[PDB]
Design a protein around this ligand. Structure first.
Ligand SMILES: NC(=O)c1ccc[n+]([C@@H]2O[C@H](COP(=O)([O-])OP(=O)(O)OC[C@H]3O[C@@H](n4cnc5c(N)ncnc54)[C@H](OP(=O)(O)O)[C@@H]3O)[C@@H](O)[C@H]2O)c1
Ligand SMILES: NC(=O)c1ccc[n+]([C@@H]2O[C@H](COP(=O)([O-])OP(=O)(O)OC[C@H]3O[C@@H](n4cnc5c(N)ncnc54)[C@H](OP(=O)(O)O)[C@@H]3O)[C@@H](O)[C@H]2O)c1
Ligand SMILES: Cc1cc(C(=O)N[C@@H](CCC(=O)O)C(=O)O)ccc1NC(=O)Nc1c(N)nc(N)[nH]c1=O
Ligand SMILES: Cc1cc(C(=O)N[C@@H](CCC(=O)O)C(=O)O)ccc1NC(=O)Nc1c(N)nc(N)[nH]c1=O
Lengths: 286, 287
């Protein structure tokens, strides 16, 4: 049986450190506070939940987090007015657009995301920050929050990354593709799989490190797991109960470390966003 | 043995089609002509060689190509002034900075590259264009010219890329990393290897498609190659004797279904893809 990576506990420790930094930073600079804005389009239930968990974390730490919720009938030009304003408001240190946009109109997601000023792009979703991470310029960019949090979970095992084979299942803009880049520049040998991969089971079996971000409940079976692998499950699926993308019961028998769902990647995602927000607040003080 | 992917023949076909494309544009819009600029820092022989090949190809196609060469002792502020001037000259449609910079002073390559207007970044080296490619937004960016040319060589086989396991050995900003992205958004399963990869022979043996860009002459031995693999050798290594690639061509040819020779493989495809990107930005400028 694998040792469980306790993300709920690990994040708690991170947020305490962030609170101390924000507490300390509010003294060294009186009247100053990190400010986060979260923009939402539409009213998805899962977007509501995740945004509120983020507001909740920001509250604990002392970050001032605003939530602007736009209606489903919002146009692309309406959204761009808000991004423009947030870019220009010098009191706002970071902001993000919760994805996907839930609009009945046609909105170019990529156009919206890429209007965000890169120095405020705490979610790391602009092409500018993605291109730096994709090319190995890691100390110059915001890195996406779920990948940042998966990397921290992997170090918690103590097992070095350099020279191990990492398999990443999924290549989405927010998780899988930046996760590949993060592991690579941490000097793993990385294979990316996706919905056109043949023999996915045999590919998954190659992974000393396995990160699954597919959105298909429990599709990655435990038999597929290389014995002793570090298994990281990014899935959160509501099913007949909350399950991940990895069949947790079987995989725990093969993994050496595993993240449970919930309480694994999820809280780490939120903690890493808070960390990037404090980092941009500090960078702003220069 | 493998069929030879003959880059000389394929590049010559692309240049001719480009030439006719330029001719028709010039007929449709009299006086107009695609304009490329190449900036160099220092006096490296290999850069001199490669830039000259690009000048010759542009001249054949009808691209007006200017070459600006700065001394080994230039400052970053001097280089930034030229990049700004090229960004601002409306008669220049694309330009590149031949890499590596050859300087006595330390110059931030990333700062220099990233000052290029993305719409003129025909080499696809700005962070903006890399981020578009890395995330599959392929319709808005210039792709770097060597990965573009590898993709054409692979498509010359007529074997679809989707579903195959591709291995890219090397992760540089100009070749290896963009090659991984190009193959991923053509729906390969991609493994990227580098100098920290253990058991490189076993990773190479997974490749239905193998792209090697290491600058380590003949380091990828032919016995590692999966039988039937498509082998793409981006290496141009001058060894004592002669040019060799990054793959042991002798044993590799016995196992691959297709293979690029060195020279006459990727090299001419690189130049041709740069010309294609230049013609493309010129057309976009007309819009
Ligand atoms: C975050 O994800 P999202 O919101 O982007 O959800 P999504 O559209 O389903 O994509 C999630 C990621 O998982 C991949 N995926 C879906 N089904 C898969 C399967 N059966 N085997 C392997 N990979 C699979 C998708 O591959 P594709 O990128 O090939 O759609 C995608 O990259
Ligand atoms: C031209 O174009 C080609 C590519 O040159 P470049 O611009 O990519 O130069 P570069 O910046 O030297 O890149 C070389 C790449 O090859 C990798 N590499 C070196 N030795 C290796 C080994 N033993 N095993 C696996 N990977 C190894 C390096 O790994 P690291 O990233 O770990 O250094 C790096 O990613 C060359 O063949 C040259 O002739
Ligand atoms: C999937 C997820 C889970 C949780 C979480 O907290 N999960 C807990 C249970 C929480 C509870 O119910 O208390 C657990 O799994 O244990 C927080 C965040 C996300 N994901 C995102 O927010 N993704 C995302 C996006 N869609 N768009 C942009 N722009 N940026 C983003 O990062
Ligand atoms: C390695 C190489 C070879 C040749 C070549 O001429 N090869 C043929 C001969 C016949 C012919 O080319 O027509 C052969 O090998 O057979 C052309 C180009 C390169 N490489 C680059 O130029 N790399 C590069 C760089 N260093 N910096 C920036 N910014 N952009 C870049 O693309």
């Amino acid at each position: 049986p694998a040792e469980i990576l306790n993300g709920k506990e690990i994040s708690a420790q991170i947020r305490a450190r962030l609170k101390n930094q924000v507490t300390q930073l509010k003294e060294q600079v009186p009247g100053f506070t990190p400010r986060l804005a979260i923009l939402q389009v539409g009213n998805r239930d899962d977007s509501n939940l995740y945004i509120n968990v983020k507001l909740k974390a920001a509250e604990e730490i002392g970050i001032k987090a605003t939530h602007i919720k736009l209606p489903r009938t919002t146009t692309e030009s309406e959204v761009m007015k808000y991004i423009t304003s947030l870019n220009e408001d010098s009191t706002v240190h970071g902001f993000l657009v919760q994805l996907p946009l839930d609009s009945e109109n046609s909105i170019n997601t990529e156009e919206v995301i890429n209007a965000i000023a890169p120095e405020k792009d705490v979610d790391g979703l602009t092409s500018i920050n993605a291109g730096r991470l994709a090319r190995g310029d890691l100390n110059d960019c915001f890195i996406p929050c779920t990948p940042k949090g998966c990397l921290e979970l992997i170090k918690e095992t103590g097992v070095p990354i350099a020279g191990r084979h990492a398999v990443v299942v999924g290549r989405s803009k927010i998780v899988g593709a930046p996760m590949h880049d993060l592991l690579l520049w941490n000097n793993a040998t990385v294979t990316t799989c996706h919905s056109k991969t043949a023999h996915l089971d045999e590919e998954v079996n190659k992974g000393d490190i396995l990160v699954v971000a597919t959105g298909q409940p429990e599709m990655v079976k435990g038999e597929w797991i290389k014995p002793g692998a570090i298994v990281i499950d990014c899935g959160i699926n509501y099913v007949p109960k909350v399950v991940g993308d990895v069949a947790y019961d079987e995989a725990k028998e093969r993994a050496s470390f595993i993240t449970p769902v919930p309480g694994g990647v999820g809280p780490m995602t939120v903690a890493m966003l808070m960390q990037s927000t404090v980092e941009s607040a500090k960078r702003f003080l220069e």
